[PDB]
Amino acid sequence: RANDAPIVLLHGFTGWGREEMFGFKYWGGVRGDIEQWLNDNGYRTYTLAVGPLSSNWDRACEAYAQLVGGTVDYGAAHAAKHGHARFGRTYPGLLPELKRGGRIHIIAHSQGGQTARMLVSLLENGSQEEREYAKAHNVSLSPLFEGGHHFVLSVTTIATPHDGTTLVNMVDFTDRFFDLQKAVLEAAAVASNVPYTSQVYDFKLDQWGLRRQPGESFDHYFERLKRSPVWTSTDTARYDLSVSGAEKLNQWVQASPNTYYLSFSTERTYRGALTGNHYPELGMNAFSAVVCAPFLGSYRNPTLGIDDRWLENDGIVNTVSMNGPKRGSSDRIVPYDGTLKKGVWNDMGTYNVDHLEIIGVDPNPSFDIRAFYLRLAEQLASLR
């Protein structure tokens, strides 16, 4: 121990706030509540809750405002390009002292990892698209695009598609993605064919002008979300989750030399005897084992360099993708030797735990979830 910085949890393409999903936690699922375990052991922990289906850009902006307070500013240039509100919601700020000079650790799961890397990237460097635009059109700029804000001491990514996931290429992907979404609903005891009055699981699509209406089931809403810009356009989680889009992301989102990056990879498959294809183990969450993993560990594509190294998977994301960014990237990934190195991806290795088990959404009695996150917190509680 000798940094005191809070931990900040960050979900992926599925995820909600503490008040949401009737208290059923993204971080902990059926195992309990990970934020609470940490706080009770004296690691101060806060939870971010951004647009699950939105782009990493949108989510970083949302994430910044949630962190220091204010209205979400997606950028005038960006807003004009993609045709959506410049301005979002207002947040009181979890840590407004961070302007004056605190520090955070981000712990991020799934696509959260991409959004954490880009939050840090934008914090340090800004965007010269938004800078040039603002002076061109004589409007204001969110401090997020100025640069010189260095306040993230660590990004820890867990089961993140740094190079993408190959699931995106699946033939029925659009439909099966929203079935994943409905599965995670069921996991939380929430049904998709009933008009919940309460918002329950808010997708936070204020920018796009999309909300679930009174008397609208999730099935219906998702059926509308499929035909919408949040599934259709460039500016989406779907896009940044494909192998090509992660590629574009990687090309501009580099590791801050002032941040400690950590990666945890996941696996819940075994190699074939005569092939190299991967197959889901007994105990992989039902939805992934049936719908997703067969494709994930058989899909080969010589054009995109998708060979045997991509087949091992955690039921959702190709395991090789979680090391750190590689495709389109300059960053350096090193195996964990004992001392966590700065400005580089410290590969903490691979765990026999599926995309939903590591967060607790699917059970795994063999995997001690509490010990994994408490072990992590203490690694993070060592310093610069």
- The residues annotated as belonging to the active site are 110, 314, 355
Q: Is 357 annotated as a binding residue?
A: yes
Residue 203 interacts, among Ca ion, a second copy, Zn ion, none and using kind-specific CB cut-offs from 5 to 8 Å, with: none
Of the pair 52, 315, the CB lying nearest Ca ion is at 315
Quick one: CA dihedral 144, 148, 153, 157, positive or negative?
positive
214 scored as a contact of a second copy (CB under 8 A):
no
Q: Is 308 annotated as a binding residue?
A: no
How distant, in Å, are the alpha carbons of 90, 235, 261, 345 from that of 256?
Answer: 28, 24, 9, 11
| Stretch binding Zn ion (CB under 5 A), from 134-142, 215-223, 230-238, 357-365 | 230-238
90 scored as a contact of a second copy (CB under 8 A):
no
58 scored as a contact of Zn ion (CB under 5 A):
yes
Tell the smallest beta-carbon distance from residue 17 to a second copy (Å). 8
Among 115, 238, 362, 369, binds Ca ion (CB under 5 A): 362
Site for Zn ion in 339-358 (CB under 5 A): none
Judged by CB under 8 A, the number of residues near a second copy is 15
333 scored as a contact of a second copy (CB under 8 A):
no
Residues 6 or more apart whose CB falls under 8 angstroms from that of 18 comprise 25, 35, 47, 49
Of the pair 137, 309, the CB lying nearest Zn ion is at 137
Tell the smallest beta-carbon distance from residue 232 to Zn ion (Å). 13
Of the pair 85, 191, the CB lying nearest a second copy is at 191
283 scored as a contact of Ca ion (CB under 5 A):
yes
State the first-to-last Cα distance of the chain, in angstroms, to the nearest integer: 11
235 scored as a contact of Zn ion (CB under 5 A):
yes
Half-sphere exposure of 121 toward its Cβ, with a 13 Å CA cutoff?
Answer: 19
Alpha-carbon dihedral of residues 176, 324, 25, 287, nearest 10 degrees? 30
240 scored as a contact of Zn ion (CB under 5 A):
no
18 scored as a contact of a second copy (CB under 8 A):
yes
Q: Is 283 annotated as a binding residue?
A: yes
Of the pair 24, 279, the CB lying nearest a second copy is at 24
Please state the residue numbers annotated as binding site for Ca(2+).
283, 357, 362-363
Residues that bind Ca ion in the complex, under the rule CB under 5 A: 283, 362-364
- Known binding residues are 58, 78, 84, 235, 283, 357, 362-363
Tell me which residues touch a second copy (CB under 8 A): 18-19, 22-24, 33, 186, 189, 191, 194, 196-200
Give residues in contact with Zn ion (CB under 5 A). 58, 82, 235
